[PDB]
Amino acid sequence: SKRTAFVMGASQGIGKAIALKLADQHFSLVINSRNLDNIESVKEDILAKHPEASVIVLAGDMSDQHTRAGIFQKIESQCGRLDVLINNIPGGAPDTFDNCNIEDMTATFTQKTVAYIDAIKRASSLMKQNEFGRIINIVGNLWKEPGANMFTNSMMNAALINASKNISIQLAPHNITVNCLNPGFIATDRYHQFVENVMKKNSISKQKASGIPMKRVGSAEETAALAAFLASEEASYITGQQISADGGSMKS
Amino acid sequence: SKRTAFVMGASQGIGKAIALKLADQHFSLVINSRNLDNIESVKEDILAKHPEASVIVLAGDMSDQHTRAGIFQKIESQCGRLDVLINNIPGGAPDTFDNCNIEDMTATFTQKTVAYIDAIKRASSLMKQNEFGRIINIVGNLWKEPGANMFTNSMMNAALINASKNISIQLAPHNITVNCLNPGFIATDRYHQFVENVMKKNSISGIPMKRVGSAEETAALAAFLASEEASYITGQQISADGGSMKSIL
Incomplete structure (x- = not known):
């Protein structure tokens, strides 16, 4: 209850599962979605189980600098603290070495990588005030x-x-851990569904169905359990780690 | 037969050493630097030591998307082939997580990382025309x-x-290798001097230790990777930073 968690991309898929799990762990939640679609039902789902839960909905695209800046100012104003950051933004459209281009590469660098680093900068400022933080970066193939x-x-x-x-080393003295979590392929995540669709198309290499893309199968609930463990008070000594929860049986 | 190599940032430091070594091993050269006078001076250096060498100079900032495209166009028209690419462009200024900033991050990404990838796309198109390529990325710590x-x-x-x-996997079927080389600290490279000066001043105001390299040895390694007998070496990263470590102050 005292601890506050900010979960990006919480309306569906990975982010939703993490938000629900953290609420079962009694964090006060700030949840975000590019728009107010679906995010309401996540809040309701949470209140259904925990009528006394604190849930703040902040909409906006965390990939926009100024928006990102504005969300963190609102967290500081409304919550007065921040203990947990779930960095969760989709990467860009699938591309290959053959078809990549500068405009799209720069755009995707800015939309995910820069966004995560800036979010960590701003989150860690608030975390330092209470000498506690958990930063979980959703990152993987x-x-x-x-x-x-x-x-x-x-x-x-x-x-x-x-x-x-590198950030983990800098933030350690302030009791802030920083870990990367690779969820693998999450069938309930709309970005993963989009990527899958493009690759089914692209993978057709012979007239009849060895070079076939194999999913590293994950699970939103499994990823959420790991994220919740990492966010806990019993994970204070775990930092600078990369942990994959993509150990489901892989399929075409 | 005769191979043509393109060496970026070859007016000093790492790139110059590599250009000289490839000339010593009989590659025809296209060399590049941001300043025309500076790169013309290195062409003269090459020809002084290697009178029979073939050297074309194409000046311009390879970090600039437009310039980079124009340079590869000129290579295609003036050379009609390309066998070796030495990707060699400075990174950004030193920084920390604490003091790093975003406007600069995107710039840094585009000036080296994107530039290398775009150069590889352009170079590999030429290399494919003769089913042979060697790409050496200078990626230094x-x-x-x-x-x-x-x-x-x-x-x-x-x-x-x-x-x-990932590129090495894609280009393998075309007999184009792709390797990364870490030269360590090179005292004659103006970017390394710049980085050292900045960090030295900061330190004066834990202590940074140089991983000392050798321009000559980096050049020798690059030339080996560029040779006929390195066709089975790809997707490798090799550091030549094995000098005795030296405190910055």
Whole structure:
């Protein structure tokens, strides 16, 4: 109850499952969605179980700088603190080395990688005030070999893992942990569904159905359990880690 | 037969050393630097040591998308082929997570990381025409603990290593190799001097340790990777930063 958690992308998929789990753990929640679609029912689902739960809905696209800045000012004003940050923004459209282009690469760098780093900067400022923080970055590949069809996203993931480890070292003295969580492929996440659709199309290489994209299958609830453990008071010594929860049996 | 190599940032430092070594190993050269006079001077250096060498100079900032496109156009028209690419462009200024900033991050991403990828796309199209290519990415860490004072550059280097490995998989069927080379700290490179000066001043105001490299050895390694007998070496990262570590102050 005392601890406050900010969950991005909470209207569906990965973010929704994490928000629900953290509420079962009695965090006060700030939940965000690009728009107010569906996010209401997440709040209701939460109040259904915990009528006395605190849930604040802040809409807006966390990929926009000025918006991101405005959300954190609102968290500081309305909550007065922040203990947990779930960085959760989709990467860009699938691309290949062959078809990548500068406009789209720059856009996707800015929309996810920069957004996560800036969010961490702003969140850690609030976290330091109470000498406690948990930063969980949702970062990972959906397929066993992402390079082929998720070229730009794979390189951004690598950058994030590197930045996260470096940030973990800087924030440790303030009891703030920073970990990356790879959920693998989440069938209930709309971005994952979108990526899957494009790759089914792209993977058709012979007239009749060895180079077939294999999902690293995850689960929103499994990812949510891990995120909740990492956010807990019993995970204070776990930082600068990358942990994958993508250990479901992989499928075409 | 005769191979043509394009070396970026070749007016000094790492790029110059590599250009000289490739000339010594009989590559025809296209060399580049932002300043025409500076790069013309290196052409003269090459020809002084290697009178029989073939050297074309194409000046311009390879970090600039428009310039980079024009340069590859000129390579295609003046050379009609390209066998070796040495990607060599400075990263951004030193920074920390604490003092890093966003306007600069995007700039840094585009000036090196995106530039290398775009150069590889353009170079590989030419290389494919003769089913042979060698791509060497200069991706350097100058200090023992790169992340602490090169926060942004470290994350970009990580992206590059990842991209290079993925590119190597894609280009393998075309007999084009793709490898990353970490030269460590090179005292004759103006970017390394710049980085050292900045960090030295800060330190004067934990202590940064240089991973000392050798321009000559980096050049020797690059030339080896560019050779006929390195066709089975791809998607590799190799550091030549094995000098005795030197405190910044």
